[PDB]
């Protein structure tokens, strides 16, 4: 819902890759991370992350902060299927709840708690 990666990569190839990568790496989950629509915030050098399933949403959060080189004062929010995910969840749990039909998990990031 406003992911460029979906625009550029048709659904059947996506699903194919998601299936394969989950088979190959069942203790990891595949995540796509893009700036939210209308977000005013530093770029992420990379978009595709293969994340250990036991890493928490908090740890992945602080990981992404670091990659953006945010300053301490700078804010960052995650959105997944129109909710903010809880920091205590594991990326594995978040993936099982939220992955789309292409077997990827999509996370939108932004500077503001405003979304739509």
């Amino acid at each position: 819902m406003g992911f460029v990666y979906k625009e550029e990569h048709p659904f059947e190839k996506r699903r194919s890759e998601g299936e394969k990568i989950r088979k190959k790496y069942p203790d990891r989950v595949p995540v796509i991370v893009e700036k939210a629509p209308k977000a005013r915030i530093g770029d992420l050098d990379k978009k595709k992350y293969l994340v250990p399933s036991d890493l928490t949403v908090g740890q992945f959060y602080f990981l992404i902060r670091k990659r953006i080189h945010l300053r301490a004062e700078d804010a960052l929010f995650f959105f997944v299927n129109n909710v903010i995910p809880p920091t205590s969840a594991t990326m594995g749990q978040l993936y099982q709840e939220h992955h789309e039909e292409d077997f990827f998990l999509y996370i939108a990031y932004s500077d503001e708690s405003v979304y739509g």
């Binding site: 595949p30 990379k46 036991d54 990981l63």
Partner: peptide, 11 residues
């Protein structure tokens, strides 16, 4: 915005 490869995150 680079989408060439998957970043293997350390456990």
């Amino acid at each position: 915005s680079d989408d060439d490869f998957w970043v293997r995150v350390a456990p």
